[PDB]
């Protein structure tokens, strides 16, 4: 499944370093 590595890598870059991690911050996965 390639695509699983590309929509998701796109949906990474989405957020951001600090943005994604926000919600880490908390309750970090």
């Known amino acids: 499944s390639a695509i699983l590595a590309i929509t998701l890598g796109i949906f ?3 957020y951001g ?4 991690k926000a919600i880490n911050d ?3 996965k």
């Open 12 to 14: 990474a870059t989405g």
């Open 17 to 20: 370093m600090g943005v994604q």
């Open 26 to 28: 908390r309750r970090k």
